[PDB]
Design a protein around this ligand. Structure first.
Ligand code: SF4
Ligand code: SF4
Ligand code: SF4
Ligand code: SF4
Ligand code: SF4
Ligand code: SF4
Ligand code: SF4
Ligand code: SF4
Ligand code: FES
Ligand code: FES
Lengths: 571, 571
């Protein structure tokens, strides 16, 4: 091993060779500001705001200069501060200053740096950016506030391997867009929502359906039922000053009950129903031994990717609905006749951490089962708007008769958790017995690796299980499968890297290790529940024996399944 | 005690009769927004943003509504939210939106309420407020961001009884002004800074001089000494997310060392200098028995209030300088000859929590001993500017030979702690012995009462002592003295209510009970020290025996004394 000695602010530093000055100065109790840098991306050097001076007398960037042995650098010299002040004055000279009306208010990094570097009087006044905004679906793009940091194109090209947007024009009028300024829906985008999560300004944000929620609640002839996702309860607490990984289920239930919503349920019931349907389909397919491999259809971004780029995989993907639409069908068809409320007077609201769900809700194939879709940020805005203090609430429980949950549906917010639930139910449906002890947990499908392969043995029969997180890794698996190197049986894809815990709806964070904390939170949540199996739930059995009488029945085929059509129109 | 039964948002409430419907709902884990209300002021009802809905169906204000038996109210009805949204749109329609240049950025309450209530598109665009910025000294007034809440007028009317500013004009063009738009120096202001502390916008701020500090640092031939106030050690941590009242001495010393300052010192040394000099003066005045009562000179605002309103008490004021100017004279007179530097080439910077110090630094009669002054908020902004992480610093001590101190000089940030620091020294100098055990602490001069009185018996000799915090209580006690009811010996006055811990330079807080926490922090800091007596300090005695040889000497009269001249201009 090779170690490197250097001096920073007159202090001796030992660092491993090859790390940058920004990374090497983390343990020294100092932080260099920068806008174009992220922990998941390569250095770009477009902000030029992270400059520090070496011994010679010139300023160099600190995010892409490797540490060489025997240099002295300074961080609080007056020249560096002057350069940073002038650079932020230049940035702020052409920014439309409607900070009252910005969705990214109180979380914008540019605003924090404008406060932090003591800017009080901008001498450069003149031409401002003046473009026209247009709708794009669930993604609201305002090119008046862009600073051309390049994070969105880098996260859409280097990680996602999709290349949906890129730079355009030259000079002062350069701007990031699609080909020929077309809307994102008919472009090559798949609505993963990663570009929204990394934008340091308010250029990229979410279309809001807040007014429709308030008009629906204000109407005295409409009954409102609201569902929450499994992955919201672990990261909702970041807005209110708590560390990530805290379980706030009861507090959020109390907040939802006090917000005016008539009924509060959870997706975990529909999640268990989806698991039952998927494992029935898997058992049937394995008995016939046809259409290998079989893909899961629980991620709207994945199904958009299949419909847009790979139309040949349409026969091989499952026909099961998303859990959101499953709960919508249950609420509009079975619960409504039980309570005695007309279908035209029922409102269903969902809280999900994804952005693909916002587009998925308005697909004409689903007959408008879900009316409006929220995100975690919108729910956190409701709580502050209504004045509810989140810290000192009293925890309550979910309503009846479909609020009770199991431990199999509590790990959908982690990559491969659907696979653990599928193996948990498949072991019981094949072997006939129930796993007890450490055999309940499948540790072979846990972690944060890009590709997760497993050879699962059930009563002497071995099956192949493949998990891919990230669209690029899914493309790699597609290339390997079409190459015919090996054959799998049951393959999961989630477009967001790391699972739904890192979707576009989750609150913004600065810690570089939020994924590990959220995984620990979800797993500790799952370990704190008496029931760990999907089929052991009673209410799912009551719903089946009350209305459908059989999984994968003709009524279930009518309501619990859908068909996909290829969107890859030829040129 | 008579209790009242009611319901608020469907929850039963038990509260005493007489509380409003906003202050009696804070203990239900719910809080309704408001801008015109503060815990130290009578309700005024100018925001009209704290409205709720009663049973009848008309919107009623909450900050001035007494509660009676039998009301049902709701604070989350759609009508109330719509009214609040429209009212905030009306406010932000006429606000100059340069939130990058605003000194109150990331702490403005209007910004936070614009974020909370989900404002996205201002429909009412029209004529804005267009006034002209004028200079006033240490108070920077910008009547373009004023929302006419009236907090400054009420706090200069109800508490201070100074009557410096008042409303002017009518209609849309009304504003806050002095008579005839004269500068605040020539008006009846006394520069207490309370109006700065309560302003919920960026209208009233500080004239910030970080720039001059920066070319002072960048000059290679100038040597910089920075001094810190006793009341800063208990309030800086609130700027970094800590609980108020945490002792952060070592952390702020490390931060000041890393900021480029050549030498760092505490002003407790000069404070003990002032204590021993004032004790000598008090012993002298007791021996002659003339010019009673005698007033302290530790507060510049008190001196201004005397020079403007009560010019007949000038012969009765102590001639001792403030500790800041005494430390400046020591640094520019004794320390400079010891190190071997020219007097013009020494730069003295102070970090004090008061606002009147900014004006006091530039008096022509002090011969420009100090060059620039700061407050705690600017110190925190500099710390965050250089990138220093305050949480993970290492404790380090002061410099030499003016770094160490005693416990008598650490309680200046409390109403009463100055005379409590002088009674021990007077006891020691007149009796000849030193207090032991719990007799060091005097429990009769601690608390938060408006006027504190005590009769202290020392060796059979009784002295009458009085404390007045707040200029209103000072005026009351001056009226009592001029009435001739009782005779005093030694009177302390601090202009800000609650002592120097509630100055204008301290960080903004929303907790209603910050004064108790700050007092507890100060007392814990005092009790965590080995030496508790000003006389037992070593370097004070060394300085006298090397340069003065006697307190109240001709050299001390030349350098540690000043004279006051009346400012009451005849009309
Ligand atoms: S949503 Fe995903 S695919 Fe679409 S532009 Fe953003 S990063 Fe690229
Ligand atoms: S759109 Fe957002 S992420 Fe992309 S360059 Fe502009 S500011 Fe950066
Ligand atoms: S992007 Fe940031 S600085 Fe720009 S308007 Fe929005 S909040 Fe203000
Ligand atoms: S992984 Fe989850 S958050 Fe990401 S696109 Fe798929 S469903 Fe949405
Ligand atoms: S007072 Fe508040 S809202 Fe107005 S410009 Fe300053 S920070 Fe923005
Ligand atoms: S500084 Fe004090 S006296 Fe002067 S206007 Fe403000 S509150 Fe009134
Ligand atoms: S100057 Fe500040 S405190 Fe005074 S009325 Fe205007 S906004 Fe209110
Ligand atoms: S009491 Fe302290 S903070 Fe207030 S004006 Fe006097 S010296 Fe300044
Ligand atoms: S973000 Fe580091 S050089 Fe631009
Ligand atoms: S601000 Fe409370 S009633 Fe006006």
């Amino acid at each position: 091993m090779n170690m490197v000695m250097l001096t920073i602010d007159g202090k001796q530093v030992q660092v491993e060779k090859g790390t940058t000055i920004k990374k090497a100065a983390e343990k020294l109790g100092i932080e260099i500001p920068g806008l174009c840098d992220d922990n998941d991306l390569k250095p770009f050097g477009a902000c030029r705001l992270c400059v520090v001076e070496d011994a010679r007398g010139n300023l160099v960037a600190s995010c892409h200069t490797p540490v060489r042995e025997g240099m002295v650098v300074k961080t609080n010299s007056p020249k560096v501060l002057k350069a940073r002040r002038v650079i932020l004055e230049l940035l702020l000279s052409s920014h439309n200053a409607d900070c009252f009306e910005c969705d990214k208010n109180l979380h914008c990094k540019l605003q924090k740096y404008a406060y932090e570097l003591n800017i009080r009087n901008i001498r450069f006044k003149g031409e401002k950016r003046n473009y026209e905004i247009k709708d794009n679906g669930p993604i609201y793009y305002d090119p008046n506030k862009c600073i051309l940091c390049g994070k969105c194109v880098r996260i859409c090209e280097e990680v996602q391997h999709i290349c949906a947007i890129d730079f355009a024009s030259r000079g002062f009028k350069a701007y990031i867009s699609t080909p020929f300024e077309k809307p994102l829906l008919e472009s090559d985008c798949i609505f993963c929502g990663q570009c929204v999560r990394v934008c340091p300004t308010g250029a990229l944000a979410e279309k809001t359906d807040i007014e429709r929620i308030y008009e629906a609640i204000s109407d005295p002839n409409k009954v409102v039922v609201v569902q929450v996702a499994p992955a919201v309860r672990v990261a909702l607490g970041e807005e209110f000053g708590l560390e990530p990984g805290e379980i706030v289920t009861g507090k959020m239930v109390a907040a939802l009950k006090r917000l005016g919503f008539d009924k509060v349920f959870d997706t975990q019931f529909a999640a268990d129903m989806t698991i039952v349907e998927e494992t029935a389909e898997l058992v049937e397919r394995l008995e016939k031994g046809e259409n290998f491999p079989m893909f899961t259809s629980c991620c709207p971004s994945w199904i958009l990717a299949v419909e847009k780029f790979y139309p040949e995989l349409i026969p091989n993907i499952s026909t099961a609905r998303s859990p959101q639409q499953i709960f919508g069908a249950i609420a509009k068809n079975y619960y409504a006749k039980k309570i005695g409320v007309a279908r035209e007077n029922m409102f269903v609201v969902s809280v999900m951490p994804c952005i693909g769900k916002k587009f998925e809700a308005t697909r004409p194939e689903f007959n408008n089962d879900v009316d409006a879709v929220l995100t975690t940020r919108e729910l956190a805005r409701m709580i502050k708007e209504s004045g509810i203090d989140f810290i000192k609430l009293e925890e309550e429980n979910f309503d009846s008769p479909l609020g009770e949950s199991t431990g199999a549906a509590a790990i959908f917010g982690v990559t491969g958790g659907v696979m653990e639930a599928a193996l948990r139910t498949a072991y019981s449906i094949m072997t006939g017995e129930e796993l007890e002890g450490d055999k309940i947990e499948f540790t072979a499908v846990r972690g944060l690796e890009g590709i997760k392969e497993a050879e699962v043995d059930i009563k002497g029969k071995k099956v192949r299980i493949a998990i891919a997180n990230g669209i690029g890794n899914a493309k790699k698996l597609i290339e390997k499968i079409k190459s015919g190197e090996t054959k799998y049986d049951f393959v999961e894809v989630m477009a967001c890297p790391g699972g739904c815990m890192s979707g576009g709806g989750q609150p913004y964070t600065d810690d570089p290790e939020f994924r590990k904390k959220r995984m620990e939170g979800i797993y500790k949540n799952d370990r704190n529940l008496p029931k760990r199996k999907s089929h052991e739930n009673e209410e799912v059995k009551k719903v089946y024996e009350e209305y459908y009488e059989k999984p994968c029945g003709p009524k279930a085929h009518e309501e619990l399944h859908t068909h996909y059509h290829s969107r890859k129109k030829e040129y």
